[PDB]
C-alpha cells in the first residue's frame, strides 16, 4: 500500500553526482593509463558488472586504487563514469568504438546495446 | 547532444538497496533509541538535509555511529530509510504522525509535504 515519489531516484543520483564533483566520500581511484578518476565504490558496483565483481571480492573490496586494463581508453571511461552518475551518455561518431569497448569491459549491457544499434544504423 | 537511459536512476537505486540488504560497504550505524540501522552515508546525505549537514561536517563525517534525538520514533525512521533506498513510502493512519515528525527532523521536504496533505484530507 506504499505511495511512490516519481523523481526520488533521479534526485538521489543528482546528489551522488554532486558528491563526486566535490570529491566528498569518494573511496576509490580508478586508474586508466595516465588518468585518474575518483568515484564511490557503491555507485560503480550499482552500474557495472565488472565493479560489482571487483568490490564483492573479500580482498579487492578494501583497495583504494583499481588499475584497469591498459587497452581501456580514458575518454571512453570518462564518458561511462559520467553516464553512471547522470543517466546521460555522450555518444558521438568519434568516440562510439571506445565507448562500446569500455562498456563491454565494464559489463554495462544497456550501453553495449545501444552502441551496437547505433553502429548497425551507420553500416 | 547526450542520449539518456530512462530507467538508469531507478536501477542504480535498486542496486544501492541490494547493497544495504547485504550490508555491503555500509559505513554508518544510525542509532534511534534501542534500534540500529546500517546505511551508506552517501545515500543518507543525498536524501536528507540533516544527514547532508552532519556528513559535510569536518568531524562528524568520520563517525561510524550517529545517535538521533531520543524523541525520534524507530519505526518512523525505518519507514523513511526504506523510502530513501526505494522511492516508496509506507504511509499509514497508524504511522503518519511519526513519519511526518521524523521527516521534519531529517529535513525531507517532499515527505513532509505529502504527510501534510494526507493529514489535511482527514480533518
Amino acid at each position: 500500500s506504499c505511495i511512490q515519489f516519481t523523481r526520488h531516484a533521479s534526485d538521489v543520483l543528482l546528489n551522488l553526482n554532486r558528491l563526486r564533483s566535490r570529491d566528498i566520500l569518494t573511496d576509490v581511484v580508478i586508474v586508466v593509463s595516465r588518468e585518474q578518476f575518483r568515484a564511490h565504490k557503491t555507485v560503480l558496483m550499482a552500474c557495472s558488472g565488472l565493479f560489482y565483481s571487483i568490490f564483492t571480492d573479500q580482498l579487492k573490496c578494501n583497495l583504494s586504487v583499481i588499475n584497469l586494463d591498459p587497452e581501456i581508453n580514458p575518454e571512453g571511461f570518462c564518458i561511462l563514469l559520467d553516464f553512471m552518475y547522470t543517466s546521460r551518455l555522450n555518444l558521438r561518431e568519434g568516440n562510439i568504438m571506445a565507448v562500446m569497448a569500455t562498456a563491454m569491459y565494464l559489463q554495462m549491457e544497456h550501453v553495449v546495446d545501444t552502441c551496437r544499434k547505433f553502429i548497425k544504423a551507420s553500416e | 547532444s547526450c542520449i539518456q537511459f530512462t530507467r538508469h536512476a531507478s536501477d542504480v537505486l535498486l542496486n544501492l538497496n541490494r547493497l544495504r540488504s547485504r550490508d555491503i560497504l555500509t559505513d554508518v550505524v544510525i542509532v534511534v533509541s534501542r534500534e540500529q540501522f546500517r546505511a551508506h552515508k552517501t545515500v543518507l546525505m543525498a536524501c536528507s538535509g540533516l544527514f547532508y549537514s552532519i556528513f559535510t561536517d569536518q568531524l562528524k563525517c568520520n563517525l561510524s555511529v550517529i545517535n538521533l534525538d531520543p524523541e525520534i520514533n524507530p519505526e518512523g525512521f525505518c519507514i523513511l530509510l526504506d523510502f530513501m533506498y526505494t522511492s516508496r513510502l509506507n504511509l499509514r493512519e497508524g504511522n503518519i504522525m511519526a513519519v511526518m515528525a521524523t521527516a521534519m527532523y531529517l529535513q525531507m521536504e517532499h515527505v513532509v509535504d505529502t504527510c501534510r496533505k494526507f493529514i489535511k484530507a482527514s480533518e
Binding site: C2, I3, Q4, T6 | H110, T114
Partner: peptide, 4 residues
C-alpha cells in the same frame, strides 16, 4: 507522488 503516485500509486505505483
Amino acid at each position: 507522488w503516485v500509486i505505483p
